[PDB]
Symmetry: C2
Subunit: 76 residues, 2 copies
């Protein structure tokens, strides 16, 4: 399952993304889109992607930075 994560702080590392999203399930892959301040996060299960989306979408979880956006992508 794919999450598009955006409005990340400039220079957020894949390891920081991995820590943030590992709280909700098994992260299979992270692809970085640094010129967009964004990333793609893949979970093993849709149930985990849903929980992380609900938990983190439009949340300023990084201090002194704006709210991170988290959108669940619809396959097919």
């Amino acid at each position: 399952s794919m999450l598009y994560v955006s409005n990340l702080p400039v220079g957020t590392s894949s390891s920081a993304i991995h820590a943030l999203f590992s709280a909700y399930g098994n992260v299979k892959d992270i692809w970085m889109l640094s010129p967009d301040n964004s990333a793609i996060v893949s979970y093993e299960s849709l149930s985990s992607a849903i929980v992380a989306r609900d938990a983190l979408h439009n949340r300023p979880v990084f201090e002194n930075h704006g709210p991170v956006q988290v959108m669940l992508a619809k396959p097919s």
Copy 2:
């Protein structure tokens, strides 16, 4: 490989996206992010994602609508 495709015409279907990106390689999956007018497209090979990124730059698509933006997502 994973491409993040943005600036889609509003309402663009996954069938239309599949048809466009099939011009450059075997499309493995498409995930729609339609509230963002965006999509994630995965190719079987990296060469195809590069070809697609380069060929689509400034190219009118979907009945001569505005070009789309294509960014190659780096795995980690």
